[PDB]
Structure 1
Amino acid sequence: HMADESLKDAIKDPALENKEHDIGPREQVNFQLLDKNNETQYYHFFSIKDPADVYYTKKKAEVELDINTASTWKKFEVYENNQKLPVRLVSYSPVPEDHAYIRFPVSDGTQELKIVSSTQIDDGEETNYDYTKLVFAKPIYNDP
């Protein structure tokens, strides 16, 4: 139901058919998706769009993550210093594109953040990705 719990079922909501998610001042920030042994997390590297759009608000900057093949993505938990962040769906491009756009707030001076996630194709084998480190090109800072 939630973005963190299951993206498969999160994108079922037709209210986010092609909802707007490109309003307000944003920033382009590159990143790298590594794994437990500091090697390239390949599945994530192909799945997530680089760079990511960093939208500004009145409190904290919200990092948008464009995730492709959302129909197979299930778990997608994001943490900041081992503290779970509130992830949510802001929009979703339907098939054949199948891109899911999710946002979450990040505090000032943040750059590294781990991702606990998984994938599942329909009623089949669940592939767990217990650790994936996401390092931005620069530390994220929100404008006043």
Structure 2
Amino acid sequence: SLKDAIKDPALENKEHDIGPREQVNFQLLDKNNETQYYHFFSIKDPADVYYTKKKAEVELDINTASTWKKFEVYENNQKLPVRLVSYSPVPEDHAYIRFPVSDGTQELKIVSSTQIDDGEETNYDYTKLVFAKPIYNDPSL
């Protein structure tokens, strides 16, 4: 729950820029390989992918975090561990999540959903995130 996850006062304007990182572009597509527009407007192209010693972590910049509810990210039909690293306040409202990706992975699905306050819940059952280039970690940097 992104609405609930951005509550943590500790994550309010926390640092998440210190790291050997790379700019990697991507496309957000639906079940018919058409530009999934809501996500296209919300998520940032390109995604900053940070390098570690084990696995490279991709950071996603999602806007309107107050409306974003569910946001599960799967690699090869397996749920990756998503975590909030930082969050911007009411007017900006950008939430920043990170998750590890295996070497060579270029595509990963996003099962997500939005909800304005306690209103109707809009479900997005399938959203494919295709990178322009396969993600490869670099422990040397």
Which bracket does the TM-score occupy, shorter chain normalised? over 0.9
Equivalent residue for 1:113, pick from 82, 105, 108: 108
Aligned to 1:18: 13
- Tell me, which stretches of 5 or more residues in structure 1 are unaligned? 1-5
Q: Tell me by how many angstroms 1:48 deviates.
A: 0.2
Tell me, in whole angstroms, the C-alpha distance in 2 between the residues paired with 1:100 and 1:20.
Answer: 12
- Tell me, which stretches of 5 or more residues in structure 2 are unaligned? none
Identity of aligned residues (%): 100
Q: Tell me by how many angstroms 1:109 deviates.
A: 0.0
Using the size of structure 1 for normalisation, the TM-score is: 0.96
Tell me, in whole angstroms, the C-alpha distance in 1 between the residues paired with 2:77 and 2:64.
Answer: 27
Task: Say if 2:31 is the partner of 1:36.
Answer: yes
Residue 27 of structure 1 aligns to a residue whose secondary structure is strand
Query: How many pairs does the alignment contain?
Result: 139
Q: Tell me by how many angstroms 1:33 deviates.
A: 0.2
Q: Tell me by how many angstroms 1:85 deviates.
A: 0.2
Q: Tell me by how many angstroms 1:15 deviates.
A: 0.6
Q: Deviations over 1:94-121 (max 9, x none)?
A: 1100000000000000010000000000
Q: Tell me by how many angstroms 1:22 deviates.
A: 0.2
Aligned to 1:3: none
Residue 45 of structure 1 aligns to a residue whose secondary structure is helix
Q: Tell me by how many angstroms 1:24 deviates.
A: 1.3
Using the size of structure 2 for normalisation, the TM-score is: 0.98
Residue 41 of structure 2 aligns to a residue whose secondary structure is helix
Tell me, in whole angstroms, the C-alpha distance in 1 between the residues paired with 2:136 and 2:33.
Answer: 25
Q: Deviations over 1:58-115 (max 9, x none)?
A: 0000000000000000000000000000000000011100000000000000010000
Tell me, in whole angstroms, the C-alpha distance in 1 between the residues paired with 2:33 and 2:132.
Answer: 16
Q: Tell me by how many angstroms 1:40 deviates.
A: 0.7
Tell me, in whole angstroms, the C-alpha distance in 2 between the residues paired with 1:24 and 1:53.
Answer: 10
Residue 138 of structure 1 aligns to a residue whose secondary structure is coil
Tell me which stretches of 4 or more aligned residues in structure 1 moved more than 4 Å. Answer: none
Equivalent residue for 2:74, pick from 79, 91, 94: 79
